[PDB]
Amino acid sequence: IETVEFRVTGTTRRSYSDFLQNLRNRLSSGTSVHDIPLLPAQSGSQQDLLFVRLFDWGNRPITLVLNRVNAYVVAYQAQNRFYLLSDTPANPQVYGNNPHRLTFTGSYGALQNVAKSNRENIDLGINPLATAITTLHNWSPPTVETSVARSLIVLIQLVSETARFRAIEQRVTNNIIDQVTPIRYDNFRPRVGIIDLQTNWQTLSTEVQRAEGGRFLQPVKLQVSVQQTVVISDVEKARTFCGLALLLRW
Amino acid sequence: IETVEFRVTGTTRRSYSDFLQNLRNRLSSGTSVHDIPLLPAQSGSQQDLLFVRLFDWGNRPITLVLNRVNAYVVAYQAQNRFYLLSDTPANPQVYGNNPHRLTFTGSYGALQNVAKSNRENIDLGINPLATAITTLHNWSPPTVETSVARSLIVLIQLVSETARFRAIEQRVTNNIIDQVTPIRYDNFRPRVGIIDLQTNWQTLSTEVQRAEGGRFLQPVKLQVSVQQTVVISDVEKARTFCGLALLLRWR
C-alpha cells in the first residue's frame, strides 16, 4: 500500500493541485479512457487500498484509507488506532486486531444525519481541512460521533471528490489566496451544482466508457440551479466542463 | 518592458498554470479587493504595459503587448516589427518608428468580423495556441488580415481571458493530458457559458468593488448554456464559481 502525503502548512494553489495529481496517479490503474484515468477493477475480494496522510497546522497527522477502486474513504487512522466506516470490509492485516467500527457508512445521507448538518452548510477550505484533521486526531470513543461524521464530510470532499472532479478542485484552488503573503485561505460551501455533480460520478464514468464516437448513449442531466439542468452528452464535455478526472471502472 | 514568457514545447497543466499566475502577479496593482487582485489605474506611462513572449513548437516567438489596466492585448511583435490594433496609441519608444497599424480593434465583434468566424467555432488548446503563434510570427502586410484576427482570438482567450477567469483556465488545463507519454493536448470550443463570462468581466469586476458585506448591489445573470442560467449575487460566488481572478478597476 502506497502513501500520499499532504500538509496544510504552506499550502498554495500549486501544492494542493500537485497533491491531487499525485493522488490520482497512485489511485489510477495507469490506463486511460478518453484521456481520463481508469481506476482499477475490483478483483475477487482483494482489497486494493491507498493511504493518504494529512497533517494539520500543528503537524499532527491522520491517515485516510482509500479504496483505489472508487477513490473513496473507507477508514482512517488516528493515534495508532484505525476507525472504520460501518460497511468497510474487515482487514486485520491493515487495520489491526481491534479497530473501532463507526456506526455509520460513508454515504452523505448517513454522514449528514450523524453530523446533524447538511454539507450545503459546511465550510470547505484549507482551514476546515486542518480543523477536520485535528478533530479526527483527537477524537476517541466513547464520545458521540457527531464531529467524526462532520470532519469526514470535509475530508471526503477535499480529497476524494476533488480527486474525482477537477471542477471541485478549482473551487478549492480559487480560495487559496497565495498571491499575497501570508497566504490567506477562504471558504466556500457546495450548492446544488456541486452536490449533483458528486452524485453523478458513477453515471458519468460509465457513460465515458460506453461512449460511441465519444458520444454518450445516455446523456447525463446535471443540476445548475434548483430550477434548471444542463445535459452532458459527450466525453469532451465531461472532461472539459465537469473536469471528470478519474473513472469508476465499468 | 517587463516580460513574462510561455513556450508550448513540453507544456503541462502545471507549466501553463504557473505562466498564468506569474502573469496575474505582474498585471496586478498589488491591491487586493475581496481576495481578488485589482488591476492598476491608467498612468499614461510605460508602467501600464506588460510583454508576454510566446513560443511555438519551433521556438519561434511573438510578443503580445498587454495593457495592465485591463489585462488585454493592444499590440504584438513578430520578427522585429510591432503590429498595433487600430485604436492603440502610437509610441515610438515602445513600438519603434515604423510599426504596422491593423485595420481592426481588439473587440470580439471586430475580430470575428475580420476572421470570418465566431469564436464559438474556433478550437482552443495548446495546438491552436502554437498555430496562432506561428501564424502571427509569419504574417506580414499586405496579405489579408483574416488569419491575424483569427490568431488573436485564440491568443486573447488563452492569455487575457484565462488570466481574468480561472474557470476558463480550468477548461484549458482539463485538456492538457500530461499523465500520458507523449503528453496529449485536446481541444475544446468555448461554450455560450464561457462567452457570457467573458462579456461580463467589467460587470462582475464592478459588482465586486461595490459589494456591501460581500453582497452585490446588482446580481449578475450568466448563461451557462443557450437555455440555462445562473445568478451571481455575492463576491464569494464570483471568486469561487466564476474564478474571477483580476478586477477591472472601477471605473
Label each residue of B79-109 as H, E or C.
CCEEEECCCCCCCHHHHCCCCEECCCCCCHH
How far lies B122's CA from each of A174, B85, B160, in Å? Answer: 27, 21, 16
Type of residue found at A32: S
Candidates B22, B179, B229, partner chain A, best to mutate (most A CBs within 10 A): B179
Which chain A residues have a beta carbon less than 8 Å from that of B188? Answer: 236, 240
How far lies B32's CA from each of A42, A124, A152, in Å? Answer: 49, 22, 33
A169 noted as active-site residue: no
Type of residue found at B100: H
Rounded distance, CA A227 to CA B133, Å? Answer: 43
The H-assigned helical ranges of chain B are: 13-27, 92-95, 108-115, 126-138, 146-156, 162-164, 166-173, 192-199, 201-210, 235-240
Rounded distance, CA B200 to CA A249, Å? Answer: 40
Residues 6+ apart with CB under 8 A from B12: B176, B178, B183
Rounded distance, CA B39 to CA B69, Å? Answer: 5
C-alpha dihedral over B183, A13, A37, A65, to 10 degrees? 140
Q: Which residue has the cell 455560450?
A: B192
Q: Which residue has the cell 513572449?
A: B53
* Radius of gyration for the alpha carbons in chain A, expressed in angstroms and rounded: 18
Burial state string for A25-46 with b = 16 or more CB within 10 A and e = fewer than 16: ebbbeeeeebbbbbbbeeeeee
Cβ atoms within 10 Å of B79's Cβ, excluding its own = 12
Cell output for A200? 453523478
On the 0-12 / 13-18 / 19+ scale of CB atoms within 10 A, A136 is: buried
Annotate A99-163 with DSSP letters as a single string.
PEEPSS-SSHHHHHHHHTS-GGGS-BSHHHHHHHHHHHHH--TTS-SHHHHHHHHHHHIIIIIHH
Bridge partners, residue B6, by sequence = B54
HSE-CB of A51 using CA atoms within 13 angstroms: 14
Instruction: Decide if B219 touches A, using CB distance below 8 A.
Output: no
Closest to B168 (Cα-Cα) out of B105, B249, B222, B93: B222
Question: Smallest CA–CA separation between B171 and chain A, in Å?
Answer: 5
Rounded distance, CA A11 to CA B142, Å? Answer: 52
Q: φ, ψ for residue A195 (rounded to 5)? A: -60, -45
Instruction: Decide if A167 touches B, using CB distance below 8 A.
Output: yes
Question: Smallest CA–CA separation between B228 and chain A, in Å?
Answer: 6
Rounded distance, CA A179 to CA B24, Å? Answer: 9
Residue A36 sits at the vertex; the CA angle it makes with B157 and A195, to the nearest 5 degrees, is 80
Question: Smallest CA–CA separation between B235 and chain A, in Å?
Answer: 11
Instruction: Decide if A179 touches B, using CB distance below 8 A.
Output: yes
Rounded distance, CA B26 to CA B30, Å? Answer: 9
Candidates B20, B33, B35, B178, partner chain A, best to mutate (most A CBs within 10 A): B35
Rounded distance, CA A65 to CA B205, Å? Answer: 42
What resolution in angstroms does the PDB record give? 1.2
Type of residue found at B241: F
Is residue B54 a contact partner of residue B131, using CB atoms and an 8 Å limit? Answer: no
Instruction: Decide if B103 touches A, using CB distance below 8 A.
Output: no
Rounded distance, CA A212 to CA A115, Å? Answer: 42
HSE-CB of B14 using CA atoms within 13 angstroms: 14
Bridge partners, residue B210, by sequence = none
Give counts: helices (H), strands (E), chain A.
10, 12
Helix (H, G, I), strand (E, B) or coil at B148: helix
For A243, the closest of B24, B170, B245 (CB atoms) is B170
Which chain A residues have a beta carbon less than 8 Å from that of B192? Answer: none
Rounded distance, CA B214 to CA B236, Å? Answer: 7
Rounded distance, CA B164 to CA B112, Å? Answer: 20
For A240, the closest of B14, B174, B240 (CB atoms) is B174
- Write out the H or E segment, with its range, that includes residue A52: strand A49-55
On the 0-12 / 13-18 / 19+ scale of CB atoms within 10 A, B101 is: middle
Helix (H, G, I), strand (E, B) or coil at B118: coil
How far lies B84's CA from each of A225, B115, B144, in Å? Answer: 43, 17, 15
Is residue B39 a contact partner of residue B249, using CB atoms and an 8 Å limit? Answer: yes
Rounded distance, CA B197 to CA B188, Å? Answer: 16
Question: Smallest CA–CA separation between B59 and chain A, in Å?
Answer: 26
Type of residue found at A243: G
Strand order in the sheet with B3-7: B3-7, B49-55, B61-67, B72-78, B81-84, B100-101
The H-assigned helical ranges of chain A are: 13-27, 92-95, 108-115, 126-138, 146-156, 162-164, 166-173, 192-199, 201-210, 235-240
C-alpha dihedral over A50, A154, A102, A248, to 10 degrees? -40
Q: φ, ψ for residue B189 (rounded to 5)? A: -115, 140
Q: φ, ψ for residue B130 (rounded to 5)? A: -60, -45
Hey, what domains does chain B have and what are their CATH numbers?
1-163 (3.40.420.10), 164-251 (4.10.470.10)
Whether the CA torsion A88, A89, A92, A98 is positive or negative: it is positive
